[PDB]
Amino acid sequence: DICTAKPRDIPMNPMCIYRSPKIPEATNRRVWELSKANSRFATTFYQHLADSKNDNDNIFLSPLSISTAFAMTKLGACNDTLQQLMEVFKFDTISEKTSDQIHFFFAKLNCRLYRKSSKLVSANRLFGDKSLTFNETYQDISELVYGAKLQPLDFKENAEQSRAAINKWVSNKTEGRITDVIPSEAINELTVLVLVNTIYFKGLWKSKFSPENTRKELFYKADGESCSASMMYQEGKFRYRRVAEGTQVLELPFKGDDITMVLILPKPEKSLAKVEKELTPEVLQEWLDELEEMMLVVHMPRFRIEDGFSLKEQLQDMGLVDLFSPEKSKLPGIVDLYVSDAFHKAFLEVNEEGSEAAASTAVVIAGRSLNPNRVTFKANRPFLVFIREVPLNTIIFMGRVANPCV
Ligand SMILES: CO[C@H]1O[C@H](COS(=O)(=O)O)[C@@H](O[C@@H]2O[C@@H](C(=O)O)[C@@H](O[C@H]3O[C@H](COS(=O)(=O)O)[C@@H](O[C@@H]4O[C@H](C(=O)O)[C@@H](O[C@H]5O[C@H](COS(=O)(=O)O)[C@@H](OC)[C@H](OC)[C@H]5OS(=O)(=O)O)[C@H](OC)[C@H]4OC)[C@H](OS(=O)(=O)O)[C@H]3OS(=O)(=O)O)[C@H](OC)[C@H]2OS(=O)(=O)O)[C@H](OS(=O)(=O)O)[C@H]1OS(=O)(=O)O
Numbered sequence: 001d002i003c004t005a006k007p008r009d010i011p012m013n014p015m016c017i018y019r020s021p022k023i024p025e026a027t028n029r030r031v032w033e034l035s036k037a038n039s040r041f042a043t044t045f046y047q048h049l050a051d052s053k054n055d056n057d058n059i060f061l062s063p064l065s066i067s068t069a070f071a072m073t074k075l076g077a078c079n080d081t082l083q084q085l086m087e088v089f090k091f092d093t094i095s096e097k098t099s100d101q102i103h104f105f106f107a108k109l110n111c112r113l114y115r116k117s118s119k120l121v122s123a124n125r126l127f128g129d130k131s132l133t134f135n136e137t138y139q140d141i142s143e144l145v146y147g148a149k150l151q152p153l154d155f156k157e158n159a160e161q162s163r164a165a166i167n168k169w170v171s172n173k174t175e176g177r178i179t180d181v182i183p184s185e186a187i188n189e190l191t192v193l194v195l196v197n198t199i200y201f202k203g204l205w206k207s208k209f210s211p212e213n214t215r216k217e218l219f220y221k222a223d224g225e226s227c228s229a230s231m232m233y234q235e236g237k238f239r240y241r242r243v244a245e246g247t248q249v250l251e252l253p254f255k256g257d258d259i260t261m262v263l264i265l266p267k268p269e270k271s272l273a274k275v276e277k278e279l280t281p282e283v284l285q286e287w288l289d290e291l292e293e294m295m296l297v298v299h300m301p302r303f304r305i306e307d308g309f310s311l312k313e314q315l316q317d318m319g320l321v322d323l324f325s326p327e328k329s330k331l332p333g334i335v336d337l338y339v340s341d342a343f344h345k346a347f348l349e350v351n352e353e354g355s356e357a358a359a360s361t362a363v364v365i366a367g368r369s370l371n372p373n374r375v376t377f378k379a380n381r382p383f384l385v386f387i388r389e390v391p392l393n394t395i396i397f398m399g400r401v402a403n404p405c406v
C-alpha cells in the first residue's frame with residue numbers, strides 16, 4: 001500500500017543520485033512540485049510531437065504515464081544516462097529529497113489520482129531478457145511503487161513468442177481496449193529491455209448531452225476541406241473564457257469534479273498550430289485561472305483518438321540519447337543493459353454519456369429561458385484536449401482532435 005506509506009517506510013534509494021550545477025489545500029507539497037514538473041515535460045513533449053505530425057492528424061497520449069515509466073529507469077540510471085533523463089523530463093528542476101525518491105512520489109501522485117465514479121485504468125510494465133540477472137532490490141521497489149517488478153522474457157530466442165505475451169498482458173489488463181501495444185517486428189532477437197505503458201479513461205459527464213440532440217455537421221479540417229461529424233449539443237453553466245486572440249477555453253467536468261476535460265478552440269483565422277507553439281506551462285495555467293462560470297451553448301463532436309507510438313525517436317530528438325545506446329547506456333541499478341524500445345498507448349472516446357460510457361440518457365429541461373446573447377462554444381474546427389485533475393492541475397491526458405469524422 002504505497003499510498004498511505006511514507007518514504008522512510010520502505011527504504012528505496014537510487015544507486016546513483018543527480019545534483020544539478022501556492023500549494024493547494026489537503027496536498028503534499030512534494031507531490032505538487034513533481035506534478036508541476038510533469039507539466040513542464042507535457043507541453044515540451046507535446047510540442048515536439050505536434051511539430052512532427054501532419055496538422056490533419058489526431059493526437060492523444062499520457063504525459064503523466066510516460067513520466068512515471070521513465071522515472072522507473074531514473075531509479076537505476078547513472079552518469080550521462082541519468083543526467084539526460086533528468087534534463088529531458090524536467091526532473092532536475094525539483095528538490096533533492098523528492099528527486100532521490102522520484103519513483104516513490106510518483107506512486108503517491110498516481111495514488112491520489114487513481115483514487116479520484118470516474119475510474120482510470122492502465123497497464124505499465126518493463127520487460128527484460130531472462131538471460132539477465134536483475135538487481136533484486138530494484139525489482140522489489142518496482143513491485144511496490146510501480147504495480148509490479150520487471151518481467152523477464154526470452155527475446156534472445158523467443159522474440160515473437162514473447163512479443164505476443166506482452167501484447168496479451170496489456171489486453172487482459174485493459175479489458176480488451178488496448179490491443180497490439182507492440183506492433184510486429186518491434187521486438188526481435190537483440191531486444192534486451194522494453195518499456196510499456198498503456199492507459200485509457202472511464203468517466204461520466206457531470207453534465208450529459210442528450211443523444212436526441214446530436215446532429216450531423218461539418219467539421220473544417222486543416223487541409224481546407226470539411227467532413228461530416230456527429231455534433232453533440234447542450235446548454236448550461238460551464239467554466240469558460242475567451243482569451244488572447246479570440247482563443248476559447250472550455251471546461252467540461254466529469255462526475256466528481258476532481259477530474260475534468262479542457263478544450264482549447266482557436267478562432268477560425270488562427271491555426272491550431274500557432275496555439276500549439278504558444279503553449280507553455282504558464283500560459284496554460286494562466287488560462288485555467290481566468291476560467292469563469294457562464295451560461296453558454298456547447299457544440300462539440302463525438303470522437304475517439306487512438307495514438308500508439310514509439311517514444312524512442314521522439315525522445316532521442318529531445319536529447320534522451322544514451323538510455324537507448326548499447327555502448328553508452330548506464331543502468332547499473334537494474335542489472336550492458338539499455339532500452340531497446342518504449343511503447344505508449346492511450347485512447348480517448350468521448351460521447352453523450354462521457355468517456356468510454358456505453359449507455360443513453362434523454363434530457364428534459366422545463367422552465368428554461370436563457371439570455372439571447374449567450375455565447376456558444378462550437379468545436380467545428382481543430383482543438384486541443386486536456387484531461388486534468390483539480391486542484392492539483394495535473395495533466396493526465398493531452399491531445400488534439402484534428403479530425404473527428406468517419
Ligand atoms: C538536507 O535537506 C534535505 O534532506 C533531508 C533529509 O532527507 S532524508 O530524510 O530523506 O534522507 C529532508 O528532510 C526530511 O524531510 C522532511 C519533509 O517534510 O519532507 C521530513 O519528512 C517526514 O515528515 C514530513 C512531515 O510529517 S508530519 O507528520 O509532520 O506532517 C512528512 O510530510 C508530510 O506528509 C503528509 C502526507 O500524508 O503525505 C502531508 O500531508 C498532506 O498531504 C496528504 C496527501 O498528499 S497527496 O495525496 O496530495 O500527495 C493529505 O492526505 C489526504 C494530508 O491531509 C491530512 C495533507 O496534510 S495538509 O496539512 O496539507 O492537510 C504533510 O503536509 C504537506 C507533509 O508535511 C510536509 C514526510 O512525508 S513525505 O513527504 O511523504 O516524505 C516524512 O517523510 S519520512 O517519514 O519518510 O521521513 C523528515 O523528517 C523525518 C526530514 O528528515 S530530518 O528530520 O532528518 O530532517 C529535507 O526536507 S525538508 O526541507 O525538511 O522538507 C531535504 O530538503 S529538500 O527539500 O529535499 O531539499
Ligand SMILES: *[C@@H]1O[C@H](CO)[C@@H](O[C@@H]2O[C@H](CO)[C@@H](O)[C@H](O)[C@H]2NC(C)=O)[C@H](O)[C@H]1NC(C)=O
Pocket residue numbers: 011012013014015134135136137138332333335
Ligand atoms: C542493487 O541495487 C541497489 C540500489 O538500487 C544497490 O544498493 C544500494 O547501495 C548503495 C551504496 O552501495 C546504497 O546507498 C543504497 O541505499 C542501496 N540501495 C538500497 C535502497 O538498498 C545494490 O548494491 C545493487 N546490487 C547489485 C545487484 O548490483
Ligand SMILES: *[C@@H]1O[C@H](CO)[C@@H](O)[C@H](O)[C@H]1NC(C)=O
Pocket residue numbers: 016017078079
Ligand atoms: C559515473 O558516475 C559515478 C558516480 O555515481 C562515478 O563514480 C563514475 O566515475 C562515473 N563514470 C564512470 C566511468 O562510471
